[PDB]
Each structure stands twice: as structure tokens, then as C-alpha cells.
Amino acid sequence: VALLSGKYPPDLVTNVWYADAIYPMYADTEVFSNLQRDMITCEAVQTLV
Amino acid sequence: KKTAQLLHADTPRLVTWDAGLCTSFKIVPIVPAQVPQDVLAYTFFTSSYAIQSPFPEAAVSRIVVHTRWASNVDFDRDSSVIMAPPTENNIHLFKQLLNTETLSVRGANPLMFRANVLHMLLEFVLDNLYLNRHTGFSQDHTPFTEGANLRSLPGPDAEKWYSIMYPTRMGTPNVSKICNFVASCVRNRVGRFDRAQMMNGAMSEWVDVFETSDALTVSIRGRWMARLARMNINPTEIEWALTECAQGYVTVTSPYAPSVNRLMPYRISNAERQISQIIRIMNIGNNATVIQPVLQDISVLLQRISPLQIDPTIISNTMSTVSESTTQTLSPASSILGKLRPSNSDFSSFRVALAGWLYNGVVTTVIDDSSYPKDGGSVTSLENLWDFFILALALPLTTDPCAPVKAFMTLANMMVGFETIPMDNQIYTQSRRASAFSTPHTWPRCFMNIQLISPIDAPILRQWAEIIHRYWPNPSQIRYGAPNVFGSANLFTPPEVLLLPIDHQPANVTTPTLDFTNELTNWRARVCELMKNLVDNQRYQPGWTQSLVSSMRGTLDKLKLIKSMTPMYLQQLAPVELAVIAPMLPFPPFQVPYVRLDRDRVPTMVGVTRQSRDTITQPALSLSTTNTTVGVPLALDARAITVALLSGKYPPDLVTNVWYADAIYPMYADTEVFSNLQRDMITCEAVQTLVTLVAQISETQYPVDRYLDWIPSLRASAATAATFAEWVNTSMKTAFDLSDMLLEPLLSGDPRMTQLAIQYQQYNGRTFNIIPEMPGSVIADCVQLTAEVFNHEYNLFGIARGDIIIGRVQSTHLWSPLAPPPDLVFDRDTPGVHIFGRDCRISFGMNGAAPMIRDETGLMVPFEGNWIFPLALWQMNTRYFNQQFDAWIKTGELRIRIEMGAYPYMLHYYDPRQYANAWNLTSAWLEEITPTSIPSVPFMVPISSDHDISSAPAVQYIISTEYNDRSLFCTNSSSPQTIAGPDKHIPVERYNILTNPDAPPTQIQLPEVVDLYNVVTRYAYETPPITAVVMGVP
């Protein structure tokens, strides 16, 4: 059903839509904390061994 | 909704009359005149003596668009385009389509502009579809003209219409601008100057007059009149067409004398009927509940018209002719009178079998499965015998192309356990139910050639196959209609021809007596003889007395010799009735050829197409793939058809000519076909208009010219195209006052590759195509002419062309911002400009170093110079750009050119003798720019003075790149001259018919310049109903 039906707004501009979609999603990002967490995880594994 | 649309459709309103003025532009006074001044004495001006003036008396006057502001009409199209003066905001016109996501009330999305203008132009055309009406005249009793004839307008307050409509009648006591202009004109070109007076003491047929109007709507109404004139017909042709339609059973008369001119627009072209038929066929497909009421209506009408009536007792009495003894348990006559089972209320099922003959291309009539034996047929039982007899009589009347094989297999299922013949496989065997054999593929190979049947093993089936193969009824054709007015809608068959599965022969005598030479009796004779063969069998008899074999052959001879008038009626009277009825049908006949036993030719598919695929622009290549199949079967009762075939009766005294003359007379007084023709024309016009308008915003396969590609428009998709098409459909339906469906079958799809064609294919693989020709359309051509004119006259419609420069300019000079000096403008080719695009990045300054922004070349520049921006860059970074650049634009030396293409504008006027600053308006405009919308551009323009004034400072911040002041009329229209500010005199080119004495009176200057004084034709034609002039003999 999802394949046979589906549509776009009759006033879509992809640049505007994707700017408005990406700004608030990236404004809440956690990659830096994840990188620090991965560093500590690797340290801990080596210490245990 | 669909079946009501099929039965009858709303009649559009074509002919409408206008009694006002043929103009749609209006001059208005933006600024008040300075009459009580202190250089000229007030006695100079003609405003103080209260002379009515042809033009407004003001310091500034401007032209605006206002459709039908002077008209007086008897029907309302209700699609007006109304424009406020440029000192008001007109954004609401440009924000009506696809601006549903705009928050501000004062802004519109630029990328939608081209969509909004096009629709606007359509509206402009739709409101001007009218005919100019001839009112009446009077001769001048004053010396102001040379005894001219002046026209009268209906309604109140005509004393101002007289001053507006004849500019050259005004006196000239003065050296004002208006007096100079009107003294420069010629004086003999006012009023009427033609007259077609054909009959004494009646209205003149038409007149030609000089009057205030514009050339554009005159052109539109000329095209409209030309179309309606090509559609016209006269009473004699109507008489001939009606006489042909009735085959001679109705006579109507026409008058013979010189009469007044009438307008009865009804003749259309054949392609229009083709296209309408195709649209309707795709509208009806695969739905039985849509088409069944049509056949019911036609059957009721067939009963109303026909002399034959059904008398069941004609069988019953013959059945009582022989007696059977009270010493037996089974009786043939009882079986007949039980299985036939008449009640005379089933006559409909008979008539429905005849109406189906007109529609075998979309409907198939098949025998209901319950008529067959419940568990299969056994030759030993009498019920099964007579069921076979009923089916073998009933099958030929249907249009099901597989009836012969169904009959053959109905007998073969009876012989299982008695005789055997080879089959093709194990699934479709001899014990298979006969109804299962429903396609040409299921036809067995023994049926084709008779060598596969043993004459010693199955002689009965050998004989039955021979009987079927050489004695099945032959198809025929008859002539019908009157194509000189109605045309024809025959797609695959030639026009004027109606096909039948049964041979037709006309009658020689109007007082018929029983005859058995008809084909239907000959078939029944074959059937009864073949029944006798297998009844006489000694293998059948053992459970039966010899007297029972005799009584079976006796009752087979009773029905062989029944007095049945049904067969002769179908051979001679029924085809005439069908040919008479057919031209009045609201859904005209649609057929595919009948084939008798030629299996290589049975039709297996009927398909209409509505769009194309990818990279295929020619219909012949894409029709074979993009089509959609159409058709449903219909179920009939076998016992009803058999009873009607056996028991037909004429009235005791019948003379056919008198009967049909009395019956057919009332039905020809109805005029629904003349409405259907106008409906067809409107449908074709709408389809072509849709194609032409859609082609402008997206790519398509048709060749069309493109005038408005300087207006910004979005990247359209399928959704945008559908959304535009729905607006087009709504406007088209509202203008012509239609409440039912129009263009909606097309809109359930992608409208960017539309096409119309139909095809059908045979069993052996041969396919036949119909591709109707596009007839052309006048609405589309008028819309394209409106586009051509708009290309030069965009200023009157509120749109300015080009770009703008933002920058501080301060001086005491009095030039207009809509026509600035060339030294204030710069462009891409100017030495020293910087051009910006997507990747501009601002870097902040430190310790007193200036901030910078990145060029396209890669160099980084500070905030002063000549920059070129596209609008979207400011749109997508609005707040940041404002907060960075506004101080430097306001006080610094920064000037920015914003590329916009087309935009609306607003005008603000001021007194030049005082200080004026425009920063507030421009700051508001800059700050109100958002990613998806902008407001109207504000301009500041000085007021013109007719005497000395002192100067004062002024600050300007927005200028336009090119000349955009075309909507200005004269300034200081009452003073002798203009001393300061922009100066303009009354435009001579608009009044060229009056100012140039050597020009012909009928000249026009489109599309470059729209004239404002023209020659107009006004008519007085009659539009009576057809019944009024064509009278039948009661």
C-alpha cells in the first residue's frame, strides 16, 4: 500500500525543506561525547587484558 | 453520479449579450488637481464652469485593469479581474495559487508567480466571452457634432456615459492639455456609420460604430463571434435532417420567405464527437451498474414504439392439441408447459437482448449459468432434452461471440456415456460444464475440422457440427442517421452504418400475413429434425413405450409449425425501429464487427489510452502499452427469450405505415441531441485549453510558443501540475455554469503527457487503432494572444520587469525612480563589480580590520562597492545579511543589485518642496524578506507641478534598472503645461485612429500597443428554440 500510494507537496523546494530538517537535528548532536566514550572503552579493554 | 452523467449532462451556456462598453481598462486620478492656485485666475479652468470632461482632471492619472467595469450583461460569468490603483497594495492577486504555506498577509512566494499570472490571464479571457448588443440611437440637436447619431446605454445615469464614450464631442475653449489633444483629433468619426437594414419596420441586422473601447477585448469577441458563426445552421437543413432521421414516418415543414437573421449554433465536427465518445467510454469502463439503466431505458422505449406483443397461449393451446392417456407417468406436453413457464412479465429480458445489439463493443450479453442442467445433461431424461432445446433456440440472439461452441458443448455434455470425441487436454474434457468454454482458446480442435469426429462412433455429433457450421445466421448492416447536422460518433465502423448479427430483409407489403421463409424458422427446423433423429433411437426407447416415441415426434412437429410472428418481425420490422431510435440516444452506439464462426477474428480486447510513457512522443508507438481494458458481461434469461421467440403476435388489423407514423411522431419533438452537441464542443475546448496552459510550466511533447519565461517559476512536479489542472477545471466549470464532471477523467493521472486514442485486437494478433485529430480551440488561442499582449503591457497589470538597485542617492533633482538616469545603473559587464553566488562566507574583523565576504573568484572584499546578488541568497540568509549589511547600506558607500526578474510594486507620492526620506519603507521591505516570501517593492515618486516651485533635499534608496513607467497617463491635464517634475502628454499612439487622418478606420496595433478608441460591430440576431420555426404535422 505504501508503494502504490505516496505524494509530495505541490510546493516543495528541496533546499528549504532540508535546511529546515537538518538544522534542529544537528543542533542536538552527541558525536563528540561518543568519541570520548570510545577512547575510554578501548583503554579499559587493554587494561583488563 | 456517473450513471446520471451518462443519461443526461448539463447544457452549457454559450450565447450571452453585452449592452455596455467593450473595454476593460480604466483611467483613474491618483492625485488631486491644484485648481485654486495663486498664479492663474480660477476663471481659466473649465472645471469651474462644470464642463464634463472625457478624462480625469488631476495632476497624475494612471491606467488600471478592471474587466467589465462599463458593461451591462444578462448573464454573469463571475470571473472578474479587479485591480486597485498602484497607490494601493495588490499582492492578493499574485498570492492566490500555491501560497497556502505563506504566513504573512503582506507577502507572496516569488517562485509561484508564473503560475498565478497564467491563471489570471485565463480569467481575463473567460470574463469577456460575450456578444455586443445593438441598443438604439438618436440624432444630435446641438452643433457639437455634424448631426451625428449617438448611442443610448440602458440603465441609470447615462449623462456621464455620453461624456465618456465620445471624447471628440467636447468643446475647445482652452489651451489645456485635454483641449489641445481633442482639437488635434478629426471630427467626422463619431457615432454610427454602417447599417444593414434588410426589412422595413424591423431591427437593423447589425451596426458599425466608433466608440471608446480597447482593441484586445474586441479581438477576443471577434474570435468568439467567428466560432459561433461557423457553428450556425438554418431551418431548412434542420427539416431535412429530421426527415432523414425518421426514415420517412415524420414530416416537418419550414417557412419560405425573407426573414430576420437568427443564430442557432449546433453543427460541430466529427473529431469532436469522436473525442467525446472516447472520454465517455473511459468514463464507463468495467462497471455494469453504470450501463444497465441505459439498456433498461432503451428496452422501455422499444416496447413503447413497437407493434409486436407477446401472447403465451399460442404455445399452450397447441400443447393441448394432442391427448396423452391417464395410464402413464411421464408426458411431453406437461414437461413443455412446466419448463417454459410463462407469465408475460419477462418481456423486458427479450427487449434487453435487442438493445445490447447497439453496444457490443463495451457490453457482452451472455446466458445465465443456471439455465444449464444442474448436474449435467443426460439424454435419457425429458427435462434435459427440452433444456437443450430451449438453450439451442435462445443462444443465437446473444452477442456473446462464443455461443456456437457453447451450444455444441451443451449437446456434447449430454452424450457422456453414449458417444465420445477427442478433446485437447485433460482439464477441458467432454464432461466439463459448457459455460466454462468462454474464450477462443477453449474451442476444441475437433470442432474445426470434421475428420476428427468418427461418423460411425458419433454420427449425431457429426450431424450437429455440420448443421452448426453451415446453418448459423449471417450478419448484416443497415443505414441510419443524418450526418449533415448530427455527424457521427462511429469509431471503428464507417459512419451511417449499424451492424447486426442477423440478416435483415425489408417488407414489400404493409398488411403482412404469416410467412416461414425467415431465417429464424429455418434454424428451428434444423433443430427439430436433429432432435427427432436421436429420439427415434432404439437405444433411447427401451424405458419408453413406442407410442411415446411417436408422441415425441408429434410434439416436435407441433412446435415446428407454431404460428410465430416473432421471427418475421425481427427479419423485417426490428432493424427499422433500431435505425429510427438510434440517433436520439444520449450515449450513441459503439460496436465492433460481428464474426460468425471465424475464430481468427473474434475480438479479445478494447483499450483506451489517456497518457504516454517515457521518451515516447508519438501516440502510435505508446498506445500498444499504455491502454486500459474496458468491458463487462451481462446475464440474460433463456426461458424468457425462448418464450418470446415462440409466442409473438401482431394486432388483429395492422397497417405498418399508419402504426409507425402515429407512434414515432411525439418523440421527434424532443431536442436533447442539440444540447449534446454543444456539450461535446465545450469538452474539446476544455481539453485543448488544459494542454496549452500546462505546457507553459513544464516540458511536454507538443510544439507551443513560450512568452512568459521571464517570470520566475518553481521546479514543478506531478503534484504541482495536478494542482494547477484542478484550478483550470474549476474556472472552466464556473464560467459556463456546469455542475457535473469535466476534465476529471483526465486528472486521475499525470497531466503532463496526455493523449487520447483507442484500439481493439483480434485473436490472431491483428490490432486496429483510432487516433482522433485535435480540432483546435479558440479559448487557448485567445489566452495566448493575451500572453502576447501582456508581454509588452505588463505595467498596466501591476508587474515590473528587471532588477533593482539598493543604494543611497541624495539630490534635489526631480527624476522618477521608474525611469532613472543611466549613470545610476550597473550590470555584470561593468568594470569594477563583484558577483556573489552560493558560497559566500563572512569573516569577522579584528583590532580595527574591516570584515570581509568572499567573491566567486576566491578573493575576499570589504563592504563597499558595486555588488551583484541573486534574490535567493538574501532569502536564505535573511537575518544574518540584514544585521551585517544594513548599517553600511544606510550610511556607507555600499550599493547592491538584486536580481528579481518580475515583481509587484507600490507607489508613494510626496510634496517636492519639503524634506523627504525613504529609509523607513526600504528598511521595512528588507526586514520583511523571508525564505519563502517577499512583499511589494516601495517606490517614492514626486508630484508634478504646473508652475514654479522651490527645491528641497530628498533621499532615495531603491531604483529600477529599466523603464517601468508605462502605466502613466497625462500629468496636469487641466493646466496649459507642466513646469517641474515628470512631464507626460496624452498618448497619441493609443488614439491613432483619431490623430492620424490617413489611417483606415479598421486598423489595429496589437500586440505592441492597445488602442483606446475603436470601431465595434453590434448585432441584433434572434435566438429562438427549434420548435418555434420547425413545425410537425399533427
Side-chain angles (χ1 to χ4, degrees), chain A residues 7-13 15-17 19-20, chain B residues 98 100-101 111-112 714 717 719-720 723 876 931:
Chain A
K7 67 183 185 295
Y8 286 166
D11 62 358
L12 177 65
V13 192
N15 289 313
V16 188
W17 185 287
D20 277 355
Chain B
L98 310 141
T100 198
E101 297 283 353
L111 301 181
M112 311 296 151
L714 74 164
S717 76
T720 75
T723 311
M876 311 285 328

Side-chain angles (χ1 to χ4, degrees), chain B residues 767-1007:
Chain B
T767 176
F768 303 88
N769 304 337
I770 299 291
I771 296 159
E773 172 187 343
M774 292 293 106
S777 168
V778 74
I779 303 295
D781 214 317
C782 290
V783 170
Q784 296 269 49
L785 173 64
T786 311
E788 288 194 57
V789 172
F790 178 89
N791 190 23
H792 289 90
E793 307 275 44
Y794 49 86
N795 277 302
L796 312 182
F797 286 83
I799 287 287
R801 183 172 177 153
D803 305 330
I804 62 176
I805 294 92
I806 313 293
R808 189 179 74 261
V809 61
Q810 202 208 349
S811 64
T812 54
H813 307 318
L814 283 74
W815 47 258
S816 175
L818 301 171
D823 197 62
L824 293 180
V825 192
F826 50 78
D827 52 339
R828 287 193 175 236
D829 297 334
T830 303
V833 302
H834 298 109
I835 296 144
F836 292 80
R838 60 211 289 201
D839 51 17
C840 65
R841 304 181 141 271
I842 299 180
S843 68
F844 76 103
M846 196 198 269
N847 305 334
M852 293 180 183
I853 186 165
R854 192 165 64 153
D855 188 10
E856 294 294 328
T857 54
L859 303 175
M860 281 185 118
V861 300
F863 301 166
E864 48 194 329
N866 292 342
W867 296 1
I868 307 295
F869 269 19
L871 178 75
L873 190 60
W874 196 294
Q875 285 205 264
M876 311 285 328
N877 304 299
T878 301
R879 198 181 60 76
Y880 194 42
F881 273 10
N882 280 119
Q883 196 253 320
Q884 293 267 0
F885 299 138
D886 281 344
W888 297 92
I889 294 172
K890 184 184 194 185
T891 301
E893 301 304 80
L894 181 56
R895 313 216 294 144
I896 311 183
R897 175 172 175 159
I898 310 288
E899 302 187 332
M900 294 177 70
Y903 51 90
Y905 57 102
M906 261 195 88
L907 302 189
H908 299 281
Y909 279 91
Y910 69 95
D911 179 17
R913 296 207 304 164
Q914 295 298 109
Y915 180 81
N917 191 328
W919 174 246
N920 284 15
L921 301 170
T922 65
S923 63
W925 187 79
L926 282 166
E927 293 179 353
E928 281 157 320
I929 287 180
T930 59
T932 170
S933 67
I934 67 168
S936 299
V937 182
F939 290 101
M940 211 185 58
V941 177
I943 300 164
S944 315
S945 177
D946 75 278
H947 58 73
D948 289 330
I949 55 170
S950 60
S951 66
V955 194
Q956 295 263 16
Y957 278 97
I958 298 186
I959 72 174
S960 72
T961 56
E962 55 197 282
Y963 183 84
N964 276 271
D965 200 349
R966 205 202 178 72
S967 62
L968 184 63
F969 205 78
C970 82
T971 66
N972 299 353
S973 66
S974 51
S975 303
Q977 64 194 261
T978 293
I979 285 285
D983 185 345
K984 183 175 174 66
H985 291 72
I986 297 177
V988 175
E989 63 268 16
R990 319 265 195 180
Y991 299 98
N992 161 268
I993 193 66
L994 288 176
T995 65
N996 192 16
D998 284 359
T1002 49
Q1003 189 186 16
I1004 51 162
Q1005 296 190 116
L1006 293 182

